[PDB]
Amino acid sequence: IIIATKNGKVRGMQLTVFGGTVTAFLGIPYAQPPLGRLRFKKPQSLTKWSDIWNATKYANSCCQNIDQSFPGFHGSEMWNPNTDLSEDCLYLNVWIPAPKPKNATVLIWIYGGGFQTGTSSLHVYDGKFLARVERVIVVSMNYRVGALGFLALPGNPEAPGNMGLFDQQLALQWVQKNIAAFGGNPKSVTLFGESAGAASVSLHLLSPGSHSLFTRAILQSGSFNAPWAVTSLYEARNRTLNLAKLTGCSRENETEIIKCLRNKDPQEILLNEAFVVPYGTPLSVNFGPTVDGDFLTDMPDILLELGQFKKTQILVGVNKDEGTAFLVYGAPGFSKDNNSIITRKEFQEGLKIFFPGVSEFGKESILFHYTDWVDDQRPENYREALGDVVGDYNFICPALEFTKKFSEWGNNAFFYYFEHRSSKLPWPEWMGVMHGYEIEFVFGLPLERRDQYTKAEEILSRSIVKRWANFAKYGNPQETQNQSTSWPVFKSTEQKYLTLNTESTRIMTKLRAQQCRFWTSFFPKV
Numbered sequence: 001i002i003i004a005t006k007n008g009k010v011r012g013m014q015l016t017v018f019g020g021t022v023t024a025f026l027g028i029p030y031a032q033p034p035l036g037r038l039r040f041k042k043p044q045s046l047t048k049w050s051d052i053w054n055a056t057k058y059a060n061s062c063c064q065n066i067d068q069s070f071p072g073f074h075g076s077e078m079w080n081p082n083t084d085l086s087e088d089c090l091y092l093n094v095w096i097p098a099p100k101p102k103n104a105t106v107l108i109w110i111y112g113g114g115f116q117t118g119t120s121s122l123h124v125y126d127g128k129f130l131a132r133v134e135r136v137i138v139v140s141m142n143y144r145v146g147a148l149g150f151l152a153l154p155g156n157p158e159a160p161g162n163m164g165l166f167d168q169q170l171a172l173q174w175v176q177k178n179i180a181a182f183g184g185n186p187k188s189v190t191l192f193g194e195s196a197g198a199a200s201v202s203l204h205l206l207s208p209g210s211h212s213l214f215t216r217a218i219l220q221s222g223s224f225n226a227p228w229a230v231t232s233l234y235e236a237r238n239r240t241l242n243l244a245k246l247t248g249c250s251r252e253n254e255t256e257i258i259k260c261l262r263n264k265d266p267q268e269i270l271l272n273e274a275f276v277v278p279y280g281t282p283l284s285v286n287f288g289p290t291v292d293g294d295f296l297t298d299m300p301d302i303l304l305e306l307g308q309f310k311k312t313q314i315l316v317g318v319n320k321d322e323g324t325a326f327l328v329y330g331a332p333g334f335s336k337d338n339n340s341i342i343t344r345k346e347f348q349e350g351l352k353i354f355f356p357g358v359s360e361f362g363k364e365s366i367l368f369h370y371t372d373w374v375d376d377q378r379p380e381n382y383r384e385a386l387g388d389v390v391g392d393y394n395f396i397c398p399a400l401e402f403t404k405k406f407s408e409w410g411n412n413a414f415f416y417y418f419e420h421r422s423s424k425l426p427w428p429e430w431m432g433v434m435h436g437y438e439i440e441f442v443f444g445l446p447l448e449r450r451d452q453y454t455k456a457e458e459i460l461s462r463s464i465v466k467r468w469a470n471f472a473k474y475g476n477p478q479e480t481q482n483q484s485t486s487w488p489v490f491k492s493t494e495q496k497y498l499t500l501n502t503e504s505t506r507i508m509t510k511l512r513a514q515q516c517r518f519w520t521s522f523f524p525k526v
């Protein structure tokens with residue numbers, strides 16, 4: 001119940017899971033609270049305590065704007081913070097099997113949310129099922145988001161950028177120093193994350209400071225080369241300066257700008273985040289990772305291309321309908337409450353929403369490549385084309401290109417295509433297999449028979465959980481016992497991938513080949 005860590009004792013709590021027990025330590029601090037003069041700085045190391053820290057409830061979530069697009073609606077509100085917001089939010093959680101394991105492999109979760117939102121306490125990130133079923137240790141941390149986590153004046157230690165990535169890194173360090181006391185093996189640590197959390201995982205593969213802090217990596221629906229994931233230094237300074245003007249903090253001393261921003265209340269900073277860009281989209285990442293010369297030593301596309309990254313195994317994948325969720329956050333003619341049949345002209349207006357700074361030629365080229373119909377008279381043609389545009393550009397083609405370029409330097413990579421739509425999905429059926437809705441299967445929520453998933457979903461989640469655990473423990477995402485399809489390595493020539501669904505698991509090749517040639521080779525030119 002009580003574990004001695006290098007900064008003090010912590011008390012956990014026992015949970016009953018599937019006729020067994022899991023010990024949970026919720027809300028262990030891993031850094032000094034980044035308050036006052038510490039706002040916008042890299043996280044500082046923790047000073048010891050002599051009490052017993054009671055880690056028996058989730059801690060505060062980091063300050064963030066909330067999704068208010070659909071009040072009362074579970075599909076959006078399940079992603080909203082479920083603990084108090086506070087700048088005092090640098091805490092982590094640990095789930096361990098009971099009895100205490102001897103040398104357990106460790107899975108560290110990094111949540112997503114566009115680098116502007118998210119928290120480790122969400123129901124769909126509950127690590128107790130993985131600890132119970134696979135006898136791994138699960139760790140998750142809160143990290144700063146939005147301008148409080150990623151505001152940048154590159155070079156200036158008062159606001160250097162990437163602070164939220166250094167939060168993640170300091171939690172990785174905490175696991176290295178402390179997890180053996182919990183029965184974990186610090187030499188067998190796998191990072192996993194989704195969307196911006198997966199982009200974060202991919203940046204830890206690039207950052208020399210993270211290379212000794214983990215073993216292997218899992219990237220669900222994200223990678224740093226996605227178009228939303230990295231902010232240019234030009235964009236970053238324009239956005240910091242715009243925030244200053246919107247808050248009355250414009251100065252000529254850049255350090256004086258930061259000191260003035262340090263006296264604003266968190267809510268004043270949050271209120272102005274959306275407006276630091278002239279044209280926002282549903283995928284806007286107003287404050288995100290930058291090339292800071294510290295966490296990130298060079299433009300990450302260069303590092304990837306030239307093989308400058310941790311050499312290890314990776315597991316990467318995407319969902320069938322990544323793009324559909326974003327359509328109801330601004331595209332005309334779309335609604336979660338009807339079937340969103342749109343016209344050609346609405347499609348064209350939708351491209352303006354999603355590609356505001358793109359030339360007319362660029363937008364025509366998207367239309368040309370996505371509107372060559374198998375049948376001109378299917379009413380859902382344009383609705384489905386816009387979702388695929390958004391998903392292929394923002395998630396699928398960057399994930400495949402990351403996997404290709406990473407595998408070219410000699411490491412085993414495994415790619416999946418998740419195509420099962422949750423029987424409980426609160427969003428409409430036209431949105432299909434949405435962004436974020438593989439997470440509950442990875443965390444084993446359908447293994448709880450009391451919670452209304454189908455039997456086929458229980459079996460799918462059980463197999464995914466085993467494959468993820470075998471990847472973390474052994475570097476190989478096989479399910480070896482139940483006559484399962486073998487998961488081949490992804491190589492840049494054959495490009496084999498595994499489909500995940502309740503019916504038939506299949507080996508396929510060259511996912512989205514035609515679409516990704518457009519996005520990866522042509523579209524970056526316009």
Ligand SMILES: *[C@@H]1O[C@H](CO[C@@H]2O[C@@H](C)[C@@H](O)[C@@H](O)[C@@H]2O)[C@@H](O[C@@H]2O[C@H](CO)[C@@H](O)[C@H](O)[C@H]2NC(C)=O)[C@H](O)[C@H]1NC(C)=O
Pocket residue numbers: 238241242243245246275276277278
């Ligand atoms: C870089 O920032 C300038 C300034 O942005 C404006 O002021 C901010 C405080 C915020 O309120 C933004 O929403 C404003 O747009 C941008 O310049 C503006 O650009 C728009 C359209 O491009 C134009 O209508 C405004 O008149 C411009 N305002 C000024 C003062 O020049 C600029 O577009 C931003 N982006 C880039 C890439 O430079």
Ligand SMILES: *[C@@H]1O[C@H](CO[C@@H]2O[C@@H](C)[C@@H](O)[C@@H](O)[C@@H]2O)[C@@H](O[C@@H]2O[C@H](CO)[C@@H](O)[C@H](O)[C@H]2NC(C)=O)[C@H](O)[C@H]1NC(C)=O
Pocket residue numbers: 331332333334335337338339340341
């Ligand atoms: C699907 O709904 C959208 C959104 O309209 C809102 O939601 C509806 C469910 C209903 O409550 C409406 O009263 C709401 O306004 C519809 O888009 C609207 O379409 C009308 C006419 O084309 C137009 O007046 C609005 O500007 C549109 N809203 C936008 C673009 O945001 C859409 O027409 C509906 N589609 C179908 C097939 O029913």
Ligand SMILES: CCCC[NH2+][C@@H](Cc1c[nH]c2ccccc12)C(=O)NCCC1CCCCCC1
Pocket residue numbers: 064065066067068075076079112113114115116117195196228282283284285325326329435436
């Ligand atoms: C301040 C509240 C949210 C801030 N607006 C953006 C920020 C953002 C969140 N995830 C992102 C991935 C890439 C780029 C940006 C983002 C936004 O929510 N888009 C819609 C997200 C949907 C939610 C409904 C169903 C779940 C799928 C994801």
Ligand SMILES: *[C@@H]1O[C@H](CO[C@@H]2O[C@@H](C)[C@@H](O)[C@@H](O)[C@@H]2O)[C@@H](O)[C@H](O)[C@H]1NC(C)=O
Pocket residue numbers: 051052054056
């Ligand atoms: C830490 O917790 C100690 C014991 O708390 C026990 O567990 C919690 C969940 C409650 O059920 C409580 O009634 C139990 O006794 C306390 O004795 C101690 O004061 C706590 N420390 C602080 C700083 O609050």
Ligand SMILES: *[C@@H]1O[C@H](CO)[C@@H](O)[C@H](O)[C@H]1NC(C)=O
Pocket residue numbers: 102103185187188
């Ligand atoms: C855990 O395993 C590692 C190798 O992965 C080994 O070096 C270490 O000594 C082990 N610790 C134990 C068994 O306590």
Ligand SMILES: *[C@@H]1O[C@H](CO)[C@@H](O)[C@H](O)[C@H]1NC(C)=O
Pocket residue numbers: 253255256
């Ligand atoms: C103002 O800028 C100078 C460098 O131009 C810097 O040394 C100084 O610290 C800044 N002012 C304050 C109060 O920090």
Ligand SMILES: *[C@@H]1O[C@H](CO)[C@@H](O)[C@H](O)[C@H]1NC(C)=O
Pocket residue numbers: 462463466479481482
């Ligand atoms: C393998 O199949 C059995 C049923 O024969 C099932 O109970 C078990 O959970 C399966 N294991 C995995 C890892 O899927």
